[PDB]
Ligand binder design. Sequence first.
Ligand SMILES: CCCCC/C=C\C\C=C/C=C/C=C/C[C@@H](O)CCCC(=O)O
Ligand SMILES: [Cl-]
Length: 298
Amino acid sequence: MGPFDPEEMLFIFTRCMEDNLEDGANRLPMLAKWKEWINEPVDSPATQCFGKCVLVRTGLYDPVAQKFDASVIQEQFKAYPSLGEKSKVEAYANAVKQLPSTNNDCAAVFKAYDPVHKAHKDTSKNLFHGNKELTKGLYEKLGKDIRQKKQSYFEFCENKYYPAGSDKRQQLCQIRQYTVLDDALFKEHTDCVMKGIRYITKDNQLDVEEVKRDFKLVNKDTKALEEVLNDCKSKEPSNAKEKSWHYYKCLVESSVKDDFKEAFDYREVRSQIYAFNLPKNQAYSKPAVMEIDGKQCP
Ligand SMILES: CCCCC/C=C\C\C=C/C=C/C=C/C[C@@H](O)CCCC(=O)O
Ligand SMILES: [Cl-]
């Protein structure tokens, strides 16, 4: 869960928008409002479910407890003291703490939170990487250590572990062709990628629904995928930091390898622009069937 860096928030915001924007006439108007932290129209199921989505993904609404949880606010402020004034952060947390228990449906959650949203908008916006001026400064500070806006997540990880100008860079020739290397560096790199596309959670758990989501987006059935993942899970290593590499290796070597490569390739494309599908859903077309930094691969 929390605290969340700017990329983690951008992932949450864009996924929740992608999953909840209407199709059709209201899509761009809605997007225009939500992008500016205007949770309107309030009577629209799309807006209500978008709001609940963000609240659930951040942990501000806990659908198991059917309660709001101000803890993430305190965790967020602890991580980013520059993004809040203590008294205003406390006021916001207190507003959340004092919300009643609330049923786990979009309308109820949205209705309950909306008064807090409006009364604490700038506090919440600033704290949760919604302020373009503040976030720009953070991205600049973090530089190569975080995935930047409009940057392929795969490129981010490659640049960290196989940096240009190093003797390791050449290994991308094989890595990009789904060669599964065995060394500690590759296991770490693969952890970077698998966590970056959310196939593996922050606490090293397989997220089967995320993998399935990417198969559906390339028109592939998910039953055989689930069966393969079930088999892979039965052979999970005890060491949590090898779990990303385990599942990557297992998938690449499995009876769904070609569908997996297709899904993973398209995910890399979409990872380049988190808002990929926001202005309108894009239809997938399989790219037609090597160089690294313009240099030809052996
Ligand atoms: C976690 C507090 C919010 C819960 C209330 C529900 C939804 C938030 C409302 C709108 C979210 C809009 C997200 C817009 C993204 C935008 O602010 C990111 C800009 C920062 C950047 O460009 O780097
Ligand atoms: Cl982006």
